[PDB]
Design an enzyme around this catalytic site. Structure first.
Site, PDB file in Angstrom:
ATOM      1  N   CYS B 118      68.810  79.000  50.381  1.00 28.96           N
ATOM      2  CA  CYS B 118      69.787  78.605  48.992  1.00 28.96           C
ATOM      3  C   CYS B 118      71.127  77.589  49.246  1.00 28.96           C
ATOM      4  O   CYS B 118      71.021  77.739  51.092  1.00 28.96           O
ATOM      5  CB  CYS B 118      70.718  79.596  48.438  1.00 28.96           C
ATOM      6  SG  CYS B 118      71.742  79.083  47.506  1.00 28.96           S
ATOM      7  N   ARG B 121      75.051  77.298  49.774  1.00 33.71           N
ATOM      8  CA  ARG B 121      75.130  78.646  49.511  1.00 33.71           C
ATOM      9  C   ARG B 121      76.953  78.928  50.109  1.00 33.71           C
ATOM     10  O   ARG B 121      78.183  79.743  50.393  1.00 33.71           O
ATOM     11  CB  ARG B 121      74.868  79.719  50.794  1.00 33.71           C
ATOM     12  CG  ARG B 121      73.924  80.688  50.734  1.00 33.71           C
ATOM     13  CD  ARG B 121      73.386  81.139  51.891  1.00 33.71           C
ATOM     14  NE  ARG B 121      72.557  80.105  51.682  1.00 33.71           N
ATOM     15  CZ  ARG B 121      71.334  80.029  52.997  1.00 33.71           C
ATOM     16  NH1 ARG B 121      71.976  81.313  54.170  1.00 33.71           N
ATOM     17  NH2 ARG B 121      70.714  79.594  53.956  1.00 33.71           N
ATOM     18  N   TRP B 290      74.880  76.234  39.415  1.00 32.52           N
ATOM     19  CA  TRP B 290      74.779  74.689  39.116  1.00 32.52           C
ATOM     20  C   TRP B 290      73.572  73.797  39.569  1.00 32.52           C
ATOM     21  O   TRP B 290      72.790  74.712  40.442  1.00 32.52           O
ATOM     22  CB  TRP B 290      76.297  74.249  39.194  1.00 32.52           C
ATOM     23  CG  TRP B 290      76.536  74.251  39.997  1.00 32.52           C
ATOM     24  CD1 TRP B 290      76.166  72.943  40.978  1.00 32.52           C
ATOM     25  CD2 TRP B 290      77.202  74.592  40.369  1.00 32.52           C
ATOM     26  NE1 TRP B 290      77.528  73.044  41.687  1.00 32.52           N
ATOM     27  CE2 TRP B 290      77.761  73.505  42.087  1.00 32.52           C
ATOM     28  CE3 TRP B 290      78.620  75.721  39.974  1.00 32.52           C
ATOM     29  CZ2 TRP B 290      79.429  74.469  42.363  1.00 32.52           C
ATOM     30  CZ3 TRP B 290      79.869  76.232  40.515  1.00 32.52           C
ATOM     31  CH2 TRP B 290      79.783  75.723  42.185  1.00 32.52           C
ATOM     32  N   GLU B 295      66.334  68.854  41.572  1.00 37.65           N
ATOM     33  CA  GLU B 295      65.235  69.910  41.199  1.00 37.65           C
ATOM     34  C   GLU B 295      64.851  69.074  39.757  1.00 37.65           C
ATOM     35  O   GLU B 295      63.574  69.181  39.651  1.00 37.65           O
ATOM     36  CB  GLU B 295      66.128  70.694  40.924  1.00 37.65           C
ATOM     37  CG  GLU B 295      67.170  71.582  41.865  1.00 37.65           C
ATOM     38  CD  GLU B 295      68.089  72.614  41.673  1.00 37.65           C
ATOM     39  OE1 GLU B 295      66.880  73.390  41.400  1.00 37.65           O
ATOM     40  OE2 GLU B 295      69.153  72.763  42.060  1.00 37.65           O
TER      41      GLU B 295
HETATM   42  C1  HEM Z   1      77.411  77.130  43.193  1.00 39.85           C
HETATM   43  C2  HEM Z   1      75.975  76.119  43.168  1.00 39.85           C
HETATM   44  C3  HEM Z   1      74.647  76.466  43.200  1.00 39.85           C
HETATM   45  C4  HEM Z   1      74.261  75.492  44.077  1.00 39.85           C
HETATM   46  C5  HEM Z   1      74.261  74.136  43.896  1.00 39.85           C
HETATM   47  C6  HEM Z   1      72.586  76.201  43.921  1.00 39.85           C
HETATM   48  C7  HEM Z   1      71.056  75.446  44.824  1.00 39.85           C
HETATM   49  C8  HEM Z   1      70.164  75.665  44.943  1.00 39.85           C
HETATM   50  C9  HEM Z   1      68.966  74.594  45.175  1.00 39.85           C
HETATM   51  C10 HEM Z   1      68.579  73.506  44.542  1.00 39.85           C
HETATM   52  C11 HEM Z   1      67.537  75.848  45.365  1.00 39.85           C
HETATM   53  C12 HEM Z   1      66.195  75.652  45.072  1.00 39.85           C
HETATM   54  C13 HEM Z   1      65.779  75.412  43.526  1.00 39.85           C
HETATM   55  C14 HEM Z   1      64.063  75.580  43.736  1.00 39.85           C
HETATM   56  O1  HEM Z   1      63.883  74.204  44.753  1.00 39.85           O
HETATM   57  O2  HEM Z   1      63.393  75.997  43.292  1.00 39.85           O
HETATM   58  C15 HEM Z   1      68.396  77.185  45.718  1.00 39.85           C
HETATM   59  C16 HEM Z   1      67.878  78.192  45.713  1.00 39.85           C
HETATM   60  C17 HEM Z   1      67.759  79.886  46.150  1.00 39.85           C
HETATM   61  N1  HEM Z   1      69.697  79.985  45.092  1.00 39.85           N
HETATM   62 FE1  HEM Z   1      71.006  78.493  45.297  1.00 39.85          FE
HETATM   63  N2  HEM Z   1      72.560  77.732  44.303  1.00 39.85           N
HETATM   64  C18 HEM Z   1      73.615  77.769  43.883  1.00 39.85           C
HETATM   65  C19 HEM Z   1      74.269  79.104  43.965  1.00 39.85           C
HETATM   66  C20 HEM Z   1      73.246  80.293  44.400  1.00 39.85           C
HETATM   67  C21 HEM Z   1      73.643  81.821  42.933  1.00 39.85           C
HETATM   68  C22 HEM Z   1      75.214  81.725  42.712  1.00 39.85           C
HETATM   69  C23 HEM Z   1      73.499  82.423  43.606  1.00 39.85           C
HETATM   70  C24 HEM Z   1      72.724  83.749  43.901  1.00 39.85           C
HETATM   71  C25 HEM Z   1      73.614  84.332  43.685  1.00 39.85           C
HETATM   72  C26 HEM Z   1      71.925  81.597  44.467  1.00 39.85           C
HETATM   73  C27 HEM Z   1      70.727  82.113  45.104  1.00 39.85           C
HETATM   74  C28 HEM Z   1      69.668  81.157  45.657  1.00 39.85           C
HETATM   75  C29 HEM Z   1      68.535  82.146  45.798  1.00 39.85           C
HETATM   76  C30 HEM Z   1      67.721  83.135  46.284  1.00 39.85           C
HETATM   77  C31 HEM Z   1      67.639  81.333  46.185  1.00 39.85           C
HETATM   78  C32 HEM Z   1      65.766  81.067  46.303  1.00 39.85           C
HETATM   79  C33 HEM Z   1      65.090  80.808  45.036  1.00 39.85           C
HETATM   80  C34 HEM Z   1      63.516  81.347  45.139  1.00 39.85           C
HETATM   81  O3  HEM Z   1      63.356  81.222  46.080  1.00 39.85           O
HETATM   82  O4  HEM Z   1      63.164  80.320  44.196  1.00 39.85           O
HETATM   83  N3  HEM Z   1      72.368  80.039  44.371  1.00 39.85           N
HETATM   84  N4  HEM Z   1      69.963  76.809  45.223  1.00 39.85           N
HETATM   85  C1  329 Z   2      66.561  76.634  38.430  1.00 44.60           C
HETATM   86  C2  329 Z   2      67.093  78.074  39.829  1.00 44.60           C
HETATM   87  C3  329 Z   2      66.788  77.843  40.775  1.00 44.60           C
HETATM   88  N1  329 Z   2      67.853  75.978  41.682  1.00 44.60           N
HETATM   89  C4  329 Z   2      69.534  75.964  40.804  1.00 44.60           C
HETATM   90  N2  329 Z   2      70.473  75.490  40.915  1.00 44.60           N
HETATM   91  C5  329 Z   2      69.434  77.641  41.076  1.00 44.60           C
HETATM   92  S1  329 Z   2      71.339  78.397  41.693  1.00 44.60           S
HETATM   93  C6  329 Z   2      70.700  79.644  41.145  1.00 44.60           C
HETATM   94  C7  329 Z   2      69.749  80.089  39.537  1.00 44.60           C
HETATM   95  C8  329 Z   2      69.401  79.045  40.059  1.00 44.60           C
HETATM   96  O1  329 Z   2      68.296  78.793  39.166  1.00 44.60           O
END
Ligand code: HEM
Ligand code: 329
Ligand code: HEM
Ligand code: H4B
Ligand code: H4B
Ligand code: 329
Lengths: 421, 421
Positions: B118, B121, B290, B295
């Site tokens: 993520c 973070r 968000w 993406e």
């Molecule tokens: C507030 C804005 C946030 C942004 C802009 C953000 C952005 C991202 C992005 C760009 C990815 C890549 C997704 C992909 O390529 O499939 C990601 C993955 C991830 N995010 Fe964040 N995130 C945010 C919040 C969160 C929150 C609130 C959580 C959990 C409480 C979180 C948990 C994760 C996890 C676990 C992944 C891995 C997902 C996977 O392995 O498929 N994110 N996030």
């Molecule tokens: C579509 C998927 C992955 N991209 C994101 N921005 C996030 S952040 C938390 C959840 C989430 O959902």
């Protein structure tokens, strides 16, 4: 049995078994992954001060000999058997051994074939080999290197080549090139705190100066060859300018691009790596292929730690260079990339765009699995510095492992060198 | 003692010690690195059919309780001591235990904080937590999920949130969302062999149909929630359209961009991950943050395995879409990215461009090392799908390791589910 690998773009599945032939330990721990570390110890082969223990050599030697003879389409058992004995006897009588020119050629191509970080490996069998294992002085090294540069440059029609100098005997008589690449630009620390030229060569530039090289304080001054022969202190040598082919940067539409007064050398050549083969180590074996546009247009020109020209190109394009969310950086880097490719094409200098290179690598990997069920690949290095997922390589899961022959990095020579004067 | 980490763009060095707290084994072998494998077992937490052995639970429980109470700026030893005993006694008397709402909130933010993949973070402590550990039926799940979607969407001013349902007891009564994301588009296999909509949801779409969902055969049909409560067969639920906010795609200059009739949902929410904390496992805990422009503009729209719209945008731009070396793909993907960002901005829907996200992450990582000397980071996921080295994240070496709390993947529910009818 085998590790399953998937290509999310195509859905295709591959079974990797070659990783079993992997040598010793790699980088990643058991509960931790590095992957993104540039110079891990797993890719570095350090210096010695004593010959290679025979218990270790003979096994590797036999192993290599078996791989070499196994590569033939039609087996030559007697020759194989003969070579096996001759090699052994040679090790018994000299405590080491010499590869036949053919085995060496085989070794250089295989090591290239085994470079996890090389995206141009589809060309692996197409390599010219200059045998300099007879070299003995800095001056001779310099001549060999010049011959190499000339042959490889070929007036812009680049040819891949490698020059192999004497193998490390006892680690006390190593042949080493202190340069990063054969042709690299100097980087100077100006009076007014600014940096001129290639900031990446600052330390090595100073070193060339501390060895008597005269700094021309330019933005594109070709550094001198700092050669070390048979373990002796390094000697400086300027490269004859006639040998260094350069490409002046021009944009096919923005006439003002040339006003930037940019250019780059046409010959990409790694100077400081070590070739490991059958228990033998070659601390000096400069090699070259040709450029992939993004190396120059993206890394060399846009890295902040390099020529850092992105903002300037932005402004000249009249972009909102003060608003990141405008994606101006994205707009600029593309024009620069087009400039580089355009310029190399107009000046008839070989070059490959990153999209084409990626497809090429995918075909290669594909062939490698059929050929030997595997292809060591470092995703982090193979995915171009721009347009990531736009390239097929991005959607390909990969296995990174160290086979043999192999091209290792080495501790910077000036950090371990025992000077004489 | 600690692993040294370098940022080649800045030269800065960091010392990672947090990796010591790493749980068990990771992905990479000892003589092999995976890194690029999407779904390795190291990131997956599977199903059970028996409670968690007490010898394993209590240690993790104590561990978590110690981490929780340790997080306070001003220690509360008695409370800590008390909680320790109460937790223990609870495990002795029930064979498991319940987290206090505050401990849960703490756990969800920490697990987010520990997500190596993520890039957003820096927002980790800013998370709304909906406690649904009292839920007991599919219908109740559906209500909770709807409340979540509404709260999070907030008419475009997106808010990060998570809804936690009952923790897995014996693995035979799991609460699970069969969807990938709360809001995802359907993918259909048309008569004429072509694929319509999101090719990535083909199988799951069929599954929704095999469960009685009526296919609207559109290009952008929102899939239904397929909810599983207390281990029972999943039930289908359509999402009230009022709750699904979408952004119509418009380019700030190419009026013809809208003619493409593209749009995307504003709410990115992961639906199928498992939250591991103090020996407890929560198989259902949909969460959202968000979007980051790329993406949608790069992956969703340009992946060949997705909406694959790149060539079409090329043509409309009148580019040499038949000559890779022209870098047309590079030209197109940028306009699409600008479209996405433009459209989200004009419709007042939260979004972050990738350049800004990267800087943001660097500040975060920087804070994390000062705060706790470490930050699990998966370079391969953190580096945007375009403009790689143009972002600072690219030049940052990183350590990828699994701490706890953590968000794991899970075996697709339909592959292990024991149906009833
Ligand atoms: C507030 C804005 C946030 C942004 C802009 C953000 C952005 C991202 C992005 C760009 C990815 C890549 C997704 C992909 O390529 O499939 C990601 C993955 C991830 N995010 Fe964040 N995130 C945010 C919040 C969160 C929150 C609130 C959580 C959990 C409480 C979180 C948990 C994760 C996890 C676990 C992944 C891995 C997902 C996977 O392995 O498929 N994110 N996030
Ligand atoms: C579509 C998927 C992955 N991209 C994101 N921005 C996030 S952040 C938390 C959840 C989430 O959902
Ligand atoms: C013929 C064309 C070739 C192309 C287009 C090509 C391209 C590339 C590129 C783009 C890189 C990345 C360099 C960087 O980012 O620093 C690379 C790395 C590498 N290439 Fe190739 N290559 C070619 C030929 C060769 C040859 C002939 C050899 C050896 C005989 C070779 C060995 C390697 C090795 C070992 C690396 C790793 C270098 C390092 O770790 O710094 N390449 N190549
Ligand atoms: C941290 C990072 O490992 C170094 O920044 C990376 C990514 N991949 C690279 N890829 C190539 N091809 N050459 C590279 O210099 C680097 N550096
Ligand atoms: C093989 C590759 O691991 C998968 O293609 C990668 C690279 N990084 C990614 N990065 C993100 N952020 N999301 C991703 O889907 C993927 N997939
Ligand atoms: C500059 C350095 C890296 N980039 C290349 N294209 C190659 S290929 C062989 C050597 C080489 O040198």
């Amino acid at each position: 049995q085998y590790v399953r690998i998937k290509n999310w773009g195509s859905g295709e599945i591959l079974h990797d078994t070659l990783h079993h032939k992997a040598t010793s330990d790699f980088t990643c721990k058991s509960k931790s992954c590095l992957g993104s570390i540039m110079n891990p110890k797993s890719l570095t082969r350090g210096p010695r001060d004593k010959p290679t223990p025979l218990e270790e050599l003979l096994p590797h030697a036999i192993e290599f000999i078996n791989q070499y003879y196994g590569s033939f389409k039609e087996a030559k058992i007697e020759e194989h058997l003969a070579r096996l004995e001759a090699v052994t006897k040679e090790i018994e009588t000299t405590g080491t051994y010499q590869l036949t020119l053919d085995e060496l050629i085989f070794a250089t191509k295989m090591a290239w074939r085994n470079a996890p970080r090389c995206i141009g490996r589809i060309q692996w069998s197409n390599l010219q080999v200059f045998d300099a294992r007879n070299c003995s002085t800095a001056q001779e090294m310099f001549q060999h290197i010049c011959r190499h540069i000339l042959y490889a440059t070929n007036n812009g029609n680049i040819r891949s080549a490698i020059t192999v100098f004497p193998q490390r005997s006892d680690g006390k008589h190593d042949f080493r090139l202190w340069n990063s690449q054969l042709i690299r630009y100097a980087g100077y620390q100006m009076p007014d705190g600014t940096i001129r030229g290639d900031a990446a060569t600052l330390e090595f530039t100073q070193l060339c100066i501390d060895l008597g090289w005269k700094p021309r304080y330019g933005r594109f001054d070709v550094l001198p060859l700092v050669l070390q022969a048979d373990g002796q202190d390094p000697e400086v040598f300027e490269i004859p300018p006639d040998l260094v082919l350069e490409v002046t940067m021009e944009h096919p539409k923005y006439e003002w691009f040339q006003e930037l007064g940019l250019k780059w050398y046409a010959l990409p050549a790694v100077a400081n790596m070590l070739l490991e083969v059958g228990g033998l180590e070659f601390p000096a074996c400069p090699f070259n292929g040709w450029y992939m546009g993004t190396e120059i247009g993206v890394r060399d020109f846009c890295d902040t730690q390099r020529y850092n020209i992105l903002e300037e190109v932005g402004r000249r394009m009249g972009l909102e260079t003060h608003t990141l969310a405008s994606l101006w950086k994205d707009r600029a880097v593309t024009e620069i990339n087009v400039a580089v490719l355009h310029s190399f094409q107009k000046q008839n200098v070989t070059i490959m765009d990153h999209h084409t290179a990626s497809e090429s690598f995918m075909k290669h990997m594909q062939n490698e699995y059929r050929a030997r069920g595997g292809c060591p690949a470092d995703w982090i290095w193979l995915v171009p510095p721009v347009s990531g997922s736009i390239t097929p390589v991005f959607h390909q899961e990969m296995l990174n492992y160290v086979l043999s022959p192999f091209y290792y990095y080495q501790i910077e020579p000036w950090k371990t060198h025992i000077w004489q004067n």
